[PDB]
Symmetry: D3
């Protein structure tokens, strides 16, 4: 189904570096539809719930602090296999090991300052989208370019 | 002062044509700070109160019908002389008469489908910003790149 | 009417400099439809007919000699006010005096090597299109993006 | 030898999405020479002869029907190892699995709407070129930039 | 003559903002040849000799101070009418009044942080070139692309 | 450490092809700092020292004769893991086998005309930096964008 959605979030460093439009453009060019978009300064309760799976890890504390250190541009894109395509486009955890052409591969140098977040699966996508967006904030009537899908 | 703000809105045709990120990128490159950003399908009352100055004009009906025909990406940029600079970058009412280099000049061909809206003065900017954004949605602590301002 | 057409031609120097795709992309982003496209090495008869209005000027000789010195990418774009918009986008006769943003303004430095040709009026557009293109080579059913025209 | 040629074709979806110039630009930047270029609406005979190898497969029908559904920009590029490089730049059959940086990787989302066609070998290139282009439409004297070849 | 040269200098703000490559690329696309290039932290004596004309002006102190506050990428471009073309491409003194498409028009917002310096005339170019560059640092054998000049 | 440095050099072909600005921009976008920059026409001994390891190889003759055949834009970038990241961005020895997204992958076609040089290790970087740059020509103080490093 082409009604698959994922959660993307340009982090404080990506926003502070003027990468918001560049990132949105990459997804628009690919053919994914922006189902939701907004800028906010994450709160602790949200950063913590968002990174729940790492609550046990050492870095968790630093993850929750930086994400709430400034504005974030949260967004939702819809399309066929968007969760895996979104991540392929982002690159890998370490921006230095990310191939040229990917977001992190082109603009990132540190793992702590890795510009953007992308859901790693449909299960997490759905959880994260419900965490950052209210239903009233997501488009229902989507309908994509007919030159994209058969 | 560099704490001046303006209201920009990528209209249904700009959004539907995948111009959102391209437009945001132009403002970020310039040095202006994104103080608010969100996507929504305008409601008739908002379309009408926004286009108030034209309620007596023939085309008003089509303005309100179109802007509410699909999602709009509303946004607020802050910076020195941003209202006038924003409009200079947008181009003129008729995209066919807009010089290359400007948004409408590069992507527009019809006056009714002219991609974006920009406040025409600080008085209107202030009015519109309050019409589309709630105070909680606008960043307070702005702070731009020190290499932009003396 | 939006069924207006103009004749553009990337000249030997524009082609030899790898500017073909860059120029086509500029027009496509604008909203104009490619109704005809082909690469060929102009014959004297066609060069002369094309530059008829300059047959009595000193430079005519050099014009006819150069346009036939290599391959030319002839093309026809359709859209509202395309003839004047195409020219506005090209720039002026002398690339050095052409504004940044325009084709000649960005890539040209000499008037003899001014990269591209564009019809100067609908009258000449129609004459030139018939000179370079056979009716069978031009699209009849054009129909552009609905987000371009009201 | 650097006189190797390949057949590329931006399909109806690539054309209708305004990607013609973008794709041509990528090949010109690389250093390949455009030996033939033209736009046309393929006929059934040409669509079928082209996809001959697939005549017995299920999808054939949809392949022929789509490629003839609208205008195609056929083109031939010449250069060292152009057939393999052209394919490397196109990406893989499934645009979702295509790496960022490649044509399909950047703009494609469905395999039925995968933007461009490229010959898979020198044997097929030679066949297809003769299928789409008449000898008079192809450049004889090519000669590429001396800063490209040793 | 096409052996005209001009002196451009990306100031500390332009360099600190990652604009060096972007600026060099605009000039290379145009067709001008890079006759000299280097990065350095200007010394007072040089900054002062450079801005000699403004020695009596109020802002003089601030000019010499800023230009020496960080690295500058000094460069010399050669080409027909390069002194006037360079400035046309830079924009005007106040970046907010500079038209989209120009360097200052696209990236600058403050007159004190106006990104780049360009000679204002052939007399000044020759003076500044000799101030920043030693003869051994400038190319003798220039020879530009033949597709540029007639 | 983030004080790692590598030596990059746009060779005569990259320079002659107007690729200098394009290449530097890729590194600046990434987040690496330009610690040294200059254009020169390599002298025979510099070329030879530089390519010591290839001395006994059949092609050392043309390697030296080429690097010294025209101007080279030598430069030093600083940042975390810059030597390995720089290489990854350049692509592989044969540009035809280099992935789209990489410098060689996007612009190169021949191995003898492979646009750019990058150090292959920290040991070589340090050797080459000292070979091409005098200590006075390199910056001491770095100050990397704080949104790059944690
Ligand atoms: O057969 C050959 C192989 C490489 N080369 C040149 C290109 C390059 F600058 C130099 C060093 O090659 P190598 O170290 O293998 O590749 P790279 O590190 O990518 O430059 O050899 C040739 O001229 N001929």
């Amino acid at each position: 189904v082409n009604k698959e959605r994922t959660f993307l979030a340009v982090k404080p460093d990506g926003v502070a570096r003027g990468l918001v439009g560049e990132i949105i453009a990459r997804y628009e060019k690919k053919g994914f539809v922006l189902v939701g978009l907004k800028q906010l300064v994450p709160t602790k309760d949200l950063a913590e719930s968002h990174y729940a799976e790492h609550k046990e890890r050492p870095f968790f504390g630093g993850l929750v602090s930086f994400i709430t250190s400034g504005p974030v541009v949260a967004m939702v894109f819809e399309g066929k296999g968007v969760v895996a395509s979104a991540r392929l486009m982002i690159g890998v955890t370490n921006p230095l090991a990310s191939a040229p052409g990917s977001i992190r591969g082109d603009f990132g140098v540190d793992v702590g300052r890795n510009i953007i977040h992308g859901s790693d699966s449909v299960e997490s996508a759905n959880r994260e989208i419900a965490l950052w967006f209210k239903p009233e904030e997501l488009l229902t009537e989507v309908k994509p370019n007919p030159n994209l899908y058969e």
